[PDB]
Paper text:
IpaH9.8 is one of the most well-studied members of the IpaH family and is secreted by Shigella flexneri during infection. In this study, we illuminated the key role of the LRR domain in autoinhibition of IpaH9.8 and revealed that IpaH9.8 can be activated by its LRR domain through substrate binding.
Crystals were obtained for the complex of the IpaH9.8 LRR domain and the full-length hGBP1, and the structure of the IpaH9.8LRR–hGBP1 complex was determined at 3.72 Å. The complex crystals belong to a space group P6122 and contained one heterodimer in each asymmetric unit. Structural analysis of the hGBP1/IpaH9.8LRR interface in both complex structures of IpaH9.8LRR–hGBP1 and IpaH9.8LRR–hGBP1LG-MD revealed that hGBP1 mainly interacted with the LRR-NT of IpaH9.8, rather than LRR-CT. This difference may have been caused by the lack of phosphate, which would normally bind to the phosphate cap. Indeed, in the IpaH9.8LRR–hGBP1 complex, the Glu147 of hGBP1 formed hydrogen-bond interactions with the Arg166 of IpaH9.8LRR (top), triggering main chain conformational changes in Arg166 and two other adjacent residues. Altogether, these results demonstrated that substrate-binding induced conformational changes in LRR-CT, which resulted in destabilization of the hydrophobic cluster and LRR-CT, which could disrupt the LRR–NEL interaction.
Residue numbers in the entry:
A (entry chain B): 3 to 158, 167 to 191, 196 to 585
B (entry chain A): 19 to 240
Amino acid sequence: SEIHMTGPMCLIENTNGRLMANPEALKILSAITQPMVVVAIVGLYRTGKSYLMNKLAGKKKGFSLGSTVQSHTKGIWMWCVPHPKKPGHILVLLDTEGLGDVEKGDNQNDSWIFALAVLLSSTFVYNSIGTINQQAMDQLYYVTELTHRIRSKSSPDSADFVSFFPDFVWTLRDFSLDLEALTPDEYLTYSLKLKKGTSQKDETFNLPRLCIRKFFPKKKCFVFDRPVHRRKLAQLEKLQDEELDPEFVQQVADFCSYIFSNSKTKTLSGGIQVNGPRLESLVLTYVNAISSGDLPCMENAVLALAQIENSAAVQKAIAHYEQQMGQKVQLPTETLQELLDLHRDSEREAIEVFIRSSFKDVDHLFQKELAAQLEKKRDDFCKQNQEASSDRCSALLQVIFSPLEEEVKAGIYSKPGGYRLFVQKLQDLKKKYYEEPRKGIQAEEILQTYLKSKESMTDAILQTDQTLTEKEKEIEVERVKAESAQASAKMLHEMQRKNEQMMEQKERSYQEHLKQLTEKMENDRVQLLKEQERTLALKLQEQEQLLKEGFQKESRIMKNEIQDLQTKMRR
Amino acid sequence: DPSTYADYFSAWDKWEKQALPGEERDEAVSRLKECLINNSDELRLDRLNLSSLPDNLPAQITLLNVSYNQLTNLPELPVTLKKLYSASNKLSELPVLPPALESLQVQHNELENLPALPDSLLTMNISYNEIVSLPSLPQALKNLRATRNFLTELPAFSEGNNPVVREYFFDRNQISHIPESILNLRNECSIHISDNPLSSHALQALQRLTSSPDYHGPRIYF
Ligand SMILES: Nc1nc2c(ncn2[C@@H]2O[C@H](COP(=O)(O)OP(=O)(O)O)[C@@H](O)[C@H]2O)c(=O)[nH]1
């Protein structure tokens, strides 16, 4: 089940004013089983981000201008190749078709293309051309729209972004400046410094830096070298590139060696290792929220993904129960506790299969639907048990008592001593019936319901066989009325105990449900705490950096944003 | 009456040497050189850190792209211009447009007022500016994009007789009133006015007006 994409395909296209997801890209997505490390390379028009993507996979010693004969006017590209350094994961490469109204306008919705690349990625790469400056932090205005573009939780905002946003990576195209004091990371931090003041120009220029600092957990910077020919367009040459990349290929082979060994696998709330179908539901639920006129929320996207994998976890749970019972149930069951114990054992494993493959079942509606379907399976297994027990005990009668049905038909037992010899043979036949093995639970009912139907013949032998006293000394026909009374009593006394045992199981099953769900919800709160502790350790990582670098004006507003989390962590 | 080749290079080599730091006027010259000689219709000067374009643009071009720069004011434009690409700059006002222009890309600027609009205009985008009122609206103009702005009115000016039109955008503004010149248009128009604080009585005056046999009315979105 390995995949190596044969040329980057369009994922979502920006056409005629809206977005329309490429179905062929979603089809190959649903076929990817392995987890994904998604690296998104965003950039403006002709920002030179192609020689990165075509290297992040390793097409050749450079790729010949990618593919310009098919420039689908769009917003996003994808390219999925196997990850070289992480064995089981799949390395996914994202890219923008190029913003900035190049051949068509419609950059109206460009602010979504940026936010979409943030939500979909695990490592965020942004390509600009050199010397991060006023003109650069103005073109990065998409990060200013994020506070109104997306939301973390849904109502029946921007504080939680740092918890799930990817790591910002700024590739500076054609810069390689020899500004003696610094290192590329020290430049990205020096550029991200603010200007103290209360003017509208101070806030308008410190705002894009606050976003790129408060919203992203990790930050790493890289630079380019740009061959010496200042007029050459996309010249297809790898040896003329070897004469044009002395310390350039050393920058790109180091940049890719960092992305390979330091980019994290794409995760969601709860350690959800995002894979093909999960990423498929992600992009689908996000664009369909955009085109419908709402803002995309990461909570609604992971809940819609839950509704997909929870119902699928129920079917795998139901099917595992059917596989177990099919190989275990030996119909007809000897007792009822044998069947109910064989049920709760295979019921336990059915719950286990659901727990491990489900996540955030809202109100546990998917778990209670499983328990409702499991109780239906519980009932018809007892009804098939009754049908199996009765259909054998009845066949026992047609083979044990049918000889006696011919001895009476032939006239025997109608003679001196006929009654006492018929009863003695019936006491023997009722014994051979009780001695036959694996009868079931309906053995007592089917026998008595057959004797009470042949009582006319047990009576007709009486008043036919004189033999002795009779006629007012018929003690053995009121004795018969006594047996058919105590038999119809212990049968009702067992229909009680049978109905009792079903309520014993209706509770031992419910206790197993609340037991496994307890351990799941326990480890659910355990993970959320660790996720909040990391999110807290990073919001304090940036408040201390505002006190350290002078700005106590923003450290206080950071403390305001942090004390809001302290109260929301509780309830 | 028109300039010569030697006249162009002199004023360009002069404009080249008044080079602010980082400002890529050297490449823009070798493009303006390359533009004039082949008489090509396209002039692309995008993302060159240009704060002021020279007053002498080749009057033979028809497509001009100077977007993504620090332009404050733009020089006089050749009458032979069809498409105008200048977005994400610091423009304060616009020179009077050529009568042969068809498209106008000026979004993400600091404009507050607009000069006259030629009837040859078919599409334009003027979002992310600070305009309040607007000049004449051409007859064939169909695609307006005035989302991010300070506008408070929409005097939809008329011409001879306007046939079928297209979608206009006025979301995220402070219009606060719909003139019936909007309602006069038939049911083939599109007018998006989302996130505009409207009048209290006019908020429901259009709701009950459109939930009716309003076959003779334009589609309103908010
Ligand atoms: N400035 C610069 N341009 C490059 C570099 N490598 C490739 N290019 C050019 O950049 C273009 C690709 O830009 P791209 O990131 O795909 O932007 P897009 O085409 O708008 O999506 C190609 O035509 C290349 O010739 C580089 O290192 N620096």
